[model samples]
Target: MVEGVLTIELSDSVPEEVKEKVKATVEELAERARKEMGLEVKIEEKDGVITVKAKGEEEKVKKFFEEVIAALKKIAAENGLKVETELTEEKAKVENGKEIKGKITGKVRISA
Candidate 1:
């Protein structure tokens, strides 16, 4: 298990409706992955960026990444918004009993 970050970028010209849908989709995907994969997923939105973090097993983290991307694409398609993704997987050391391993972090930017 490892800790990593996944980044996603969205077209600046995306519509409000599309953005809302994307948010909902991402949240839902994170919740589902957390429940099904025994992961701790956290999503934060700021400056047109959405970040998702999941701490658990490597395989589970990957699964979250896959699901998040798919969900984003689905939402974008439904709202007719252009989307892009950039993911980074790296090794992270756990501190104390925190068990920060097997974590997935995703960051996204929507075009202005």
Candidate 2:
């Protein structure tokens, strides 16, 4: 009804310590996607690796993981996918901002 859409939730794509961090990003990204460009979110876990999928339009998806992956890489290198998150202040910009047009930040921890 508004624009292209996608969604993100507090799933098991990260470690327990980093769960909250991922959650912070989830909320913000979902919010922005809803307001700016909606997204088609998904959850596909295989071999103990989970990920938050946010599917948007053409340009949206391109910039989506582009920035998102970049942002999380640093967090992963620094925190080692254990305690990397501060998505609250940063917020989502799946529409293209300082952060990932679609960032989840981390190695996307897998579960059993």
Candidate 3:
């Protein structure tokens, strides 16, 4: 199942060059998700916005985001910046196993 989606929007203050690093970092993370966790990841980018949506078992998905969070923190420490991010989890309903969207919104540090 499509387990969750992570949306990261960099502040306009960030330069294009650093944004490229951010995209690369995010891409590596997504690749790790696919390789280590066996999750499928889709990434979309527009302007300063980067979105990562992943599909996998719920538990694996949860662990994957935990790593993503830590990596983002590391990125912030290295670059010294901040980004507005939204994390949404797809929960399967009990009766029908339908998807329910639950949102967790916050920020990640970013800098150049």
Best by TM-score: 3
| Residues 1-112, model 3: lDDT tens digits | 4445677777777888877877888898788767876667778877677777766666665676787888787667666665434454434565566555443333343534
lDDT string for model 2 (28-61, tens) is 6656764676466554434434455555554665
Assess the local accuracy of residue 101 in candidate 3 as a C-alpha lDDT between 0 and 100. 46
lDDT of 1 by residue, 64-101 (tens): 66766776677657755556555555446557866444
* Clash numbers, per candidate: 5, 11, 4
Give me the runs in candidate 1 sitting further than 4 Å from their true place: 9-12, 74-80, 91-112
Candidate 1 yields a Cα-based lDDT of 0.63
TM-score (all chains, Cα) for each model: 0.66, 0.46, 0.71
RMSD of each: 4.4, 11.3, 3.5
Question: lDDT order of candidates, best first?
Answer: 3, 1, 2
Model 3 has an lDDT value of 0.66
For residue 88, give model 1's deviation from the true position in Å.
Answer: 2.5
Over all chains combined, what TM-score does candidate 3 have? 0.71
Question: Model 3, 55: alpha-carbon shift in Å?
Answer: 1.4
Task: Give the top-scoring candidate (lDDT).
Answer: 3
